[PDB]
Amino acid sequence: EIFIYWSKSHNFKREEQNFVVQNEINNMSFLTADSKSKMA
Amino acid sequence: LGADELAYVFNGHRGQRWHLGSEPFGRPWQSGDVVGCMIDLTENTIIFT
Q1: Which of A2, A36, B16, B35 could form a disulfide with B11 if both were Cys (CB 3.0 to 4.6 A apart)?
Q2: Which residues neighbour A39 within 8 Å (Cβ) at sequence distance 6 or greater?
Q3: Range list of β-strands (E), B1-49
Q4: Nearest Cα residue to B39 out of B14, B7, B16, B15
Q5: How far apart are alpha carbons B39 and A18 in whole angstroms?
Q6: Within A1-40, where are the H helices?
Q7: b or e along B9-21 (b: 16 or more beta carbons within 10 Å of the residue's beta carbon)?
Q8: CA of residue A26 relative to chain centroid, distance
Q9: Closest Cα of chain A to B7: distance in Å?
Q10: B21 touching A, CB under 8 A?
């Protein structure tokens, strides 16, 4: 449901992008942390 | 295997992917670990689990 709202709403997506860029959120860290945390 | 263009492989002794040379990829296996090799010829991709 949340993803459907995201796809449907223009404002929701753009504010998500704005949040991410201003706050310097990596997101690739969150997704790939297991290998990174394990540091192999 | 993988030194040439004729193979796309994973080596879990070092955590490498081989095709026309070696590149780091994934993590080494332990004893008893199972590697699942998947090939999608509609998206033209190779996946290892």
Answers
A1: B16
A2: none
A3: 9-11, 16-18, 22-24, 37-40, 45-48
A4: B7
A5: 37
A6: 2-8, 10-23, 28-38
A7: ebbeeeebbbbee
A8: 8
A9: 25
A10: no
